[PDB]
Amino acid sequence: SRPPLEYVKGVPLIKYFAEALGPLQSFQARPDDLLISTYPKSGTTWVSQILDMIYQGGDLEKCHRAPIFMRVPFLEFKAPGIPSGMETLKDTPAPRLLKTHLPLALLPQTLLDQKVKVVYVARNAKDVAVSYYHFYHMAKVHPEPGTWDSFLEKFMVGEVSYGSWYQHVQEWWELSRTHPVLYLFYEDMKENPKREIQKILEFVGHSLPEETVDFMVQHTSFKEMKKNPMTNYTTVPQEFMDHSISPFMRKGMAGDWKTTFTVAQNERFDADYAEKMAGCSLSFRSEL
Ligand SMILES: Nc1ncnc2c1ncn2[C@@H]1O[C@H](COP(=O)(O)O)[C@@H](OP(=O)(O)O)[C@H]1O
Ligand SMILES: N#Cc1cc2ccc(O)cc2oc1=O
Ligand SMILES: N#Cc1cc2ccc(O)cc2oc1=O
């Protein structure tokens, strides 16, 4: 019940996900797999739903066949009495959509060797930190988040589940130079979802009629996804996620970090961020 993170090769993980790495060593990627890769709270569920709808050719009834966590196996997932990502994967027909948050240091080598297409989604660090603080409260496999101030301090040094946001978004950006990676930003998807759905279509090599793309924009909207029981995580057991503490589909906005960060926290965070992000060519928008 709120166990401590377990470190594996330098990365702090949920203890059950660290145990899941064992069976995951026997995982074999196929060349037509597609991997959705994100640091937590950056738009994983959102891009999973858009990808699954594309894969069903826009058919909303087919997307309702099961919750998003069953349609898109979470590779390192495990929790007591719930089937593991690996067990769910065995029944998943190809072409498969796969989800992970693992740093490159832990990622199954077979996904790089097979040259599997990666949709990566990054989000600005300050909205990730606020989103992640609330998530820690409702998703009970995490350690106690503590106060917002104390969790922010852990976030800045990467002492949270899956480690450093700074290292994650930079290493996957570097990976995109030598591996097929479509690198998206949450904030771009908020600004123009149609434009980003069109880019994902081109990446996976499908085209769909314009009326179908407009239909997907509407069904992958925050409001539609908050009330869809197949995407909003409300079917998972209460002992694992408690939506009365914080909903999974919480606010869905870019820039709302500004009502949580104090001025002092923002000053400290901005000076730390400039050092961490100095050599990187990425640039994030903090608001629209
Ligand atoms: N269709 C959508 N549009 C915008 N944001 C969405 C969304 N679906 C989920 N989100 C937001 O993405 C975050 C969850 O990300 P992940 O799926 O990677 O865990 C939450 O952010 P907030 O906590 O800021 O509201 C969630 O509300
Ligand atoms: N009940 C239940 C379940 C919850 C659940 C949560 C997350 C996940 O990745 C996969 C999951 O599979 C399940 O069967
Ligand atoms: N229990 C539990 C869960 C933990 C969890 C952690 C990260 C994540 O991206 C999705 C997740 O879904 C879950 O059901």
Short mmCIF file of C-alpha atoms and ligand atoms in Angstrom, two decimals:
data_model
loop_
_atom_site.label_atom_id
_atom_site.label_comp_id
_atom_site.label_asym_id
_atom_site.label_seq_id
_atom_site.Cartn_x
_atom_site.Cartn_y
_atom_site.Cartn_z
CA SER A 1 0.00 0.00 0.00
CA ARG A 2 2.02 2.99 -1.30
CA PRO A 3 5.24 1.00 -1.39
CA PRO A 4 8.66 2.85 -1.89
CA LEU A 5 10.04 3.07 -5.50
CA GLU A 6 12.56 0.39 -6.46
CA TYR A 7 15.61 1.59 -8.46
CA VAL A 8 16.64 -0.40 -11.55
CA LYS A 9 19.77 0.75 -13.57
CA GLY A 10 19.46 4.19 -12.20
CA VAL A 11 15.65 4.63 -12.72
CA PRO A 12 13.12 4.67 -9.81
CA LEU A 13 10.06 2.57 -10.67
CA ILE A 14 6.88 1.39 -9.04
CA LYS A 15 7.92 -1.89 -7.35
CA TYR A 16 5.39 -3.93 -9.38
CA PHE A 17 6.63 -2.46 -12.69
CA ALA A 18 10.21 -3.25 -11.69
CA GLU A 19 9.14 -6.91 -11.13
CA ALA A 20 7.39 -6.82 -14.55
CA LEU A 21 10.78 -6.15 -16.25
CA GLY A 22 11.58 -9.88 -15.65
CA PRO A 23 8.85 -11.38 -17.85
CA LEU A 24 9.28 -8.45 -20.23
CA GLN A 25 12.78 -9.73 -21.11
CA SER A 26 11.07 -12.46 -23.20
CA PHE A 27 9.05 -9.91 -25.20
CA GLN A 28 9.58 -9.99 -28.98
CA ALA A 29 8.64 -6.89 -31.06
CA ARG A 30 7.22 -7.36 -34.54
CA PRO A 31 8.19 -5.00 -37.36
CA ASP A 32 4.58 -3.67 -37.70
CA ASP A 33 4.28 -2.80 -33.99
CA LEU A 34 3.86 0.86 -33.08
CA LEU A 35 5.09 2.10 -29.69
CA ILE A 36 3.54 5.05 -27.84
CA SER A 37 6.25 6.40 -25.57
CA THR A 38 5.83 9.27 -23.10
CA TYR A 39 7.05 10.46 -19.78
CA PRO A 40 3.99 10.11 -17.45
CA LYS A 41 1.12 12.65 -17.69
CA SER A 42 2.18 14.05 -21.11
CA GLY A 43 -0.75 12.90 -23.28
CA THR A 44 -0.41 9.04 -23.38
CA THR A 45 -4.12 8.29 -23.07
CA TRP A 46 -5.02 10.98 -25.55
CA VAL A 47 -2.66 9.79 -28.34
CA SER A 48 -3.60 6.12 -27.56
CA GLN A 49 -7.26 6.86 -28.28
CA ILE A 50 -6.40 8.78 -31.49
CA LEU A 51 -4.15 5.83 -32.67
CA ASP A 52 -6.73 3.22 -31.78
CA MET A 53 -9.46 5.15 -33.71
CA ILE A 54 -7.13 5.39 -36.77
CA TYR A 55 -6.50 1.66 -36.46
CA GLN A 56 -10.25 1.00 -36.42
CA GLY A 57 -10.65 3.31 -39.43
CA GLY A 58 -12.63 5.88 -37.33
CA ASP A 59 -15.16 3.26 -36.08
CA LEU A 60 -16.27 4.45 -32.64
CA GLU A 61 -18.14 1.17 -31.85
CA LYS A 62 -14.90 -0.82 -32.33
CA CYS A 63 -12.97 1.56 -30.04
CA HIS A 64 -15.61 0.73 -27.35
CA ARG A 65 -14.64 -3.05 -27.44
CA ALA A 66 -12.57 -2.66 -24.25
CA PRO A 67 -10.85 -0.06 -22.06
CA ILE A 68 -7.87 1.77 -23.60
CA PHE A 69 -5.50 -0.10 -21.22
CA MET A 70 -6.73 -3.42 -22.73
CA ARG A 71 -6.70 -2.19 -26.38
CA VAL A 72 -3.17 -0.73 -25.99
CA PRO A 73 -1.02 -3.01 -23.69
CA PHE A 74 1.12 -1.03 -21.19
CA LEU A 75 4.42 -3.04 -21.56
CA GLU A 76 5.86 -2.83 -18.05
CA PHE A 77 2.46 -2.79 -16.30
CA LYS A 78 1.74 -5.08 -13.34
CA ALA A 79 -0.44 -4.75 -10.22
CA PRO A 80 -1.62 -7.42 -7.70
CA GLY A 81 -4.67 -9.39 -9.02
CA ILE A 82 -4.77 -7.33 -12.33
CA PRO A 83 -3.33 -8.96 -15.50
CA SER A 84 0.10 -7.70 -16.50
CA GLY A 85 0.86 -5.72 -19.75
CA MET A 86 2.73 -8.79 -20.92
CA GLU A 87 -0.26 -11.09 -20.26
CA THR A 88 -2.62 -8.66 -22.01
CA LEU A 89 -0.19 -8.48 -24.97
CA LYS A 90 -0.50 -12.23 -25.71
CA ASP A 91 -4.11 -11.73 -26.82
CA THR A 92 -3.56 -8.52 -28.78
CA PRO A 93 -3.99 -8.93 -32.58
CA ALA A 94 -1.44 -7.30 -34.97
CA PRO A 95 -0.82 -4.57 -35.89
CA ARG A 96 -0.42 -3.86 -32.19
CA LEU A 97 -0.34 -0.53 -30.43
CA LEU A 98 1.95 -0.74 -27.34
CA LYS A 99 2.43 1.81 -24.54
CA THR A 100 5.46 2.46 -22.30
CA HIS A 101 7.05 5.15 -20.11
CA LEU A 102 10.39 3.31 -19.76
CA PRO A 103 13.63 5.35 -20.18
CA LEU A 104 15.87 4.17 -23.00
CA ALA A 105 18.15 2.54 -20.41
CA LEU A 106 15.33 0.02 -19.64
CA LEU A 107 13.51 -0.21 -23.03
CA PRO A 108 13.41 -3.74 -24.56
CA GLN A 109 16.20 -3.78 -27.16
CA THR A 110 13.95 -5.72 -29.57
CA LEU A 111 11.85 -2.50 -30.22
CA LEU A 112 14.92 -0.63 -31.48
CA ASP A 113 16.31 -3.60 -33.48
CA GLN A 114 12.96 -4.21 -35.20
CA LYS A 115 12.86 -0.45 -36.09
CA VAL A 116 9.36 -0.18 -34.63
CA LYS A 117 7.67 3.17 -35.33
CA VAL A 118 7.46 5.31 -32.13
CA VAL A 119 4.86 8.07 -31.50
CA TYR A 120 6.49 10.10 -28.66
CA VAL A 121 4.54 12.89 -26.89
CA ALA A 122 6.21 15.54 -24.81
CA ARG A 123 4.52 18.11 -22.60
CA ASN A 124 5.95 21.18 -20.83
CA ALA A 125 7.54 20.22 -17.50
CA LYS A 126 5.48 22.45 -15.24
CA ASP A 127 2.08 21.10 -16.38
CA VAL A 128 3.59 17.53 -16.20
CA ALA A 129 4.67 18.17 -12.58
CA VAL A 130 1.19 19.40 -11.50
CA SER A 131 -0.59 16.64 -13.37
CA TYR A 132 1.79 14.08 -11.87
CA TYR A 133 1.27 15.42 -8.27
CA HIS A 134 -2.51 14.88 -8.59
CA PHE A 135 -2.02 11.50 -10.17
CA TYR A 136 0.19 10.38 -7.28
CA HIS A 137 -2.76 11.13 -4.98
CA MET A 138 -5.34 9.09 -6.84
CA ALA A 139 -3.18 6.22 -8.17
CA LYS A 140 -2.41 4.32 -5.07
CA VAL A 141 0.55 2.14 -6.33
CA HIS A 142 2.72 5.35 -5.97
CA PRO A 143 4.52 6.39 -2.73
CA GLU A 144 2.91 9.26 -0.76
CA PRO A 145 3.37 12.40 -2.80
CA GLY A 146 3.71 14.57 0.36
CA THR A 147 3.14 18.35 0.04
CA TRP A 148 3.04 20.04 -3.41
CA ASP A 149 6.27 21.82 -2.44
CA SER A 150 8.06 18.59 -1.48
CA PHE A 151 6.85 16.72 -4.57
CA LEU A 152 8.08 19.55 -6.81
CA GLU A 153 11.55 19.26 -5.20
CA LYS A 154 11.57 15.48 -5.94
CA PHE A 155 10.35 16.12 -9.49
CA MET A 156 13.30 18.47 -10.17
CA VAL A 157 15.85 15.81 -9.17
CA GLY A 158 13.95 13.00 -10.85
CA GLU A 159 13.17 11.18 -7.62
CA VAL A 160 9.64 10.24 -8.81
CA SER A 161 8.37 7.15 -10.61
CA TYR A 162 10.24 6.72 -13.99
CA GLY A 163 12.90 9.25 -13.05
CA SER A 164 13.82 12.51 -14.64
CA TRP A 165 11.45 14.31 -17.05
CA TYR A 166 14.54 16.31 -18.31
CA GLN A 167 16.44 13.13 -19.27
CA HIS A 168 13.36 11.45 -20.80
CA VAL A 169 12.28 14.17 -23.25
CA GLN A 170 15.94 14.81 -24.27
CA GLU A 171 16.96 11.14 -24.89
CA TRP A 172 13.89 10.42 -27.00
CA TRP A 173 14.47 13.60 -28.97
CA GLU A 174 18.02 12.44 -29.68
CA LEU A 175 16.66 8.92 -30.56
CA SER A 176 14.47 10.52 -33.29
CA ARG A 177 17.61 11.34 -35.33
CA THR A 178 18.39 7.66 -35.92
CA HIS A 179 15.07 5.76 -35.39
CA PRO A 180 11.58 6.46 -36.90
CA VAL A 181 9.97 8.64 -34.26
CA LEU A 182 7.12 11.08 -34.63
CA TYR A 183 7.80 13.55 -31.85
CA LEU A 184 4.62 15.46 -30.80
CA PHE A 185 3.91 18.08 -28.19
CA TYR A 186 0.82 18.09 -26.00
CA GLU A 187 0.52 21.86 -26.42
CA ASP A 188 0.43 21.54 -30.26
CA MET A 189 -2.41 19.03 -29.94
CA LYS A 190 -4.28 21.43 -27.65
CA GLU A 191 -3.79 24.28 -30.18
CA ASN A 192 -4.82 22.40 -33.33
CA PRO A 193 -5.88 18.73 -32.77
CA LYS A 194 -6.87 18.29 -36.45
CA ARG A 195 -3.37 19.28 -37.59
CA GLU A 196 -1.76 16.74 -35.21
CA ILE A 197 -4.15 13.93 -36.13
CA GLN A 198 -3.14 14.64 -39.82
CA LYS A 199 0.53 14.29 -38.92
CA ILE A 200 -0.08 10.94 -37.11
CA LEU A 201 -2.04 9.71 -40.19
CA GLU A 202 0.87 10.59 -42.50
CA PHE A 203 3.37 8.88 -40.07
CA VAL A 204 1.46 5.63 -39.96
CA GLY A 205 0.80 5.88 -43.78
CA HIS A 206 -3.08 5.92 -43.77
CA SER A 207 -5.47 8.42 -45.21
CA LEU A 208 -9.00 8.95 -44.11
CA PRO A 209 -11.82 11.16 -45.50
CA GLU A 210 -12.02 14.70 -44.04
CA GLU A 211 -15.39 13.97 -42.36
CA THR A 212 -13.73 10.96 -40.57
CA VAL A 213 -10.78 13.11 -39.35
CA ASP A 214 -13.30 15.72 -38.01
CA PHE A 215 -15.18 12.85 -36.36
CA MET A 216 -11.91 11.65 -34.65
CA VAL A 217 -11.08 15.22 -33.49
CA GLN A 218 -14.43 15.31 -31.76
CA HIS A 219 -14.15 11.90 -30.19
CA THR A 220 -10.62 12.50 -28.90
CA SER A 221 -11.58 15.80 -27.31
CA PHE A 222 -11.10 16.16 -23.52
CA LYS A 223 -14.85 16.39 -22.95
CA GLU A 224 -15.63 13.22 -24.95
CA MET A 225 -12.71 11.32 -23.35
CA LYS A 226 -13.66 12.40 -19.75
CA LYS A 227 -17.09 10.81 -20.14
CA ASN A 228 -16.07 7.75 -22.15
CA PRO A 229 -15.81 4.86 -19.61
CA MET A 230 -13.45 3.15 -22.09
CA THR A 231 -10.85 5.98 -21.86
CA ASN A 232 -11.40 7.70 -18.53
CA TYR A 233 -10.00 4.87 -16.31
CA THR A 234 -13.19 4.71 -14.22
CA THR A 235 -13.48 0.87 -14.67
CA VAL A 236 -10.17 0.14 -12.89
CA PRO A 237 -10.56 -1.17 -9.29
CA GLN A 238 -11.04 1.50 -6.57
CA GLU A 239 -8.11 -0.04 -4.63
CA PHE A 240 -5.83 1.05 -7.49
CA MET A 241 -7.24 4.44 -8.64
CA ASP A 242 -9.62 6.56 -6.59
CA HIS A 243 -11.37 9.08 -8.83
CA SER A 244 -13.00 10.80 -5.83
CA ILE A 245 -9.46 11.89 -4.74
CA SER A 246 -8.59 13.24 -8.27
CA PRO A 247 -10.12 12.23 -11.64
CA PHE A 248 -7.81 10.70 -14.18
CA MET A 249 -9.31 13.04 -16.83
CA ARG A 250 -8.56 16.03 -14.61
CA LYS A 251 -8.43 19.36 -16.46
CA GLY A 252 -6.85 18.79 -19.86
CA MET A 253 -5.40 22.31 -20.31
CA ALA A 254 -2.06 23.80 -21.23
CA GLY A 255 -0.90 26.59 -18.82
CA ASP A 256 -2.95 25.77 -15.77
CA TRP A 257 0.31 25.10 -13.78
CA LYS A 258 0.22 28.85 -13.11
CA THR A 259 -2.54 28.40 -10.44
CA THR A 260 -0.42 25.87 -8.56
CA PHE A 261 3.25 27.04 -8.73
CA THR A 262 4.06 29.84 -6.32
CA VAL A 263 6.27 32.73 -7.55
CA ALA A 264 9.21 31.40 -5.43
CA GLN A 265 8.75 27.84 -6.85
CA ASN A 266 8.54 29.22 -10.38
CA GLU A 267 11.77 31.26 -9.93
CA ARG A 268 13.68 28.25 -8.52
CA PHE A 269 12.25 25.89 -11.15
CA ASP A 270 13.08 28.24 -14.06
CA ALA A 271 16.78 28.68 -13.00
CA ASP A 272 17.12 24.86 -12.54
CA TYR A 273 15.40 24.22 -15.92
CA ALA A 274 17.78 26.60 -17.83
CA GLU A 275 20.73 24.61 -16.57
CA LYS A 276 19.17 21.22 -17.31
CA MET A 277 17.90 22.09 -20.79
CA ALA A 278 20.98 24.22 -21.90
CA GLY A 279 22.39 21.85 -24.53
CA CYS A 280 19.11 20.73 -25.89
CA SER A 281 17.51 22.05 -29.08
CA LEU A 282 13.92 21.25 -27.87
CA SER A 283 11.66 24.14 -27.02
CA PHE A 284 8.41 23.90 -25.09
CA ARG A 285 5.46 26.21 -24.78
CA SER A 286 4.31 26.75 -21.12
CA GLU A 287 0.92 28.18 -22.25
CA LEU A 288 -1.16 28.95 -25.35
N1 LIG B 1 -8.35 14.32 -24.96
C1 LIG B 1 -7.55 15.01 -24.11
N2 LIG B 1 -7.28 16.32 -24.36
C2 LIG B 1 -6.49 17.04 -23.56
N3 LIG B 1 -5.91 16.49 -22.46
C3 LIG B 1 -6.16 15.18 -22.16
C4 LIG B 1 -6.97 14.40 -22.98
N4 LIG B 1 -7.03 13.11 -22.46
C5 LIG B 1 -6.29 13.14 -21.31
N5 LIG B 1 -5.73 14.39 -21.16
C6 LIG B 1 -4.84 14.80 -20.08
O1 LIG B 1 -3.55 14.14 -20.20
C7 LIG B 1 -3.07 13.90 -18.82
C8 LIG B 1 -2.93 12.41 -18.61
O2 LIG B 1 -1.80 12.03 -19.39
P1 LIG B 1 -1.36 10.48 -19.47
O3 LIG B 1 -2.50 9.89 -20.31
O4 LIG B 1 -0.05 10.60 -20.22
O5 LIG B 1 -1.29 9.95 -18.05
C9 LIG B 1 -4.11 14.53 -17.86
O6 LIG B 1 -3.69 15.92 -17.73
P2 LIG B 1 -4.17 16.93 -16.53
O7 LIG B 1 -3.92 16.13 -15.24
O8 LIG B 1 -3.38 18.17 -16.80
O9 LIG B 1 -5.66 17.25 -16.75
C10 LIG B 1 -5.35 14.34 -18.72
O10 LIG B 1 -6.43 15.14 -18.19
N1 LIG B 2 -9.47 -4.39 -13.65
C1 LIG B 2 -8.56 -4.04 -14.28
C2 LIG B 2 -7.55 -3.65 -14.98
C3 LIG B 2 -6.93 -2.45 -14.68
C4 LIG B 2 -5.85 -2.07 -15.46
C5 LIG B 2 -5.19 -0.88 -15.21
C6 LIG B 2 -4.11 -0.49 -15.98
C7 LIG B 2 -3.64 -1.26 -17.02
O1 LIG B 2 -2.57 -0.86 -17.76
C8 LIG B 2 -4.27 -2.48 -17.33
C9 LIG B 2 -5.36 -2.92 -16.58
O2 LIG B 2 -5.98 -4.11 -16.86
C10 LIG B 2 -7.05 -4.49 -16.10
O3 LIG B 2 -7.63 -5.58 -16.35
N1 LIG B 3 -2.45 0.87 -10.58
C1 LIG B 3 -2.13 1.48 -11.51
C2 LIG B 3 -1.78 2.15 -12.55
C3 LIG B 3 -0.58 2.85 -12.54
C4 LIG B 3 -0.24 3.57 -13.68
C5 LIG B 3 0.93 4.28 -13.73
C6 LIG B 3 1.29 5.00 -14.86
C7 LIG B 3 0.48 5.03 -15.98
O1 LIG B 3 0.85 5.74 -17.08
C8 LIG B 3 -0.72 4.32 -16.00
C9 LIG B 3 -1.13 3.58 -14.89
O2 LIG B 3 -2.30 2.89 -14.88
C10 LIG B 3 -2.65 2.18 -13.76
O3 LIG B 3 -3.73 1.54 -13.75
#
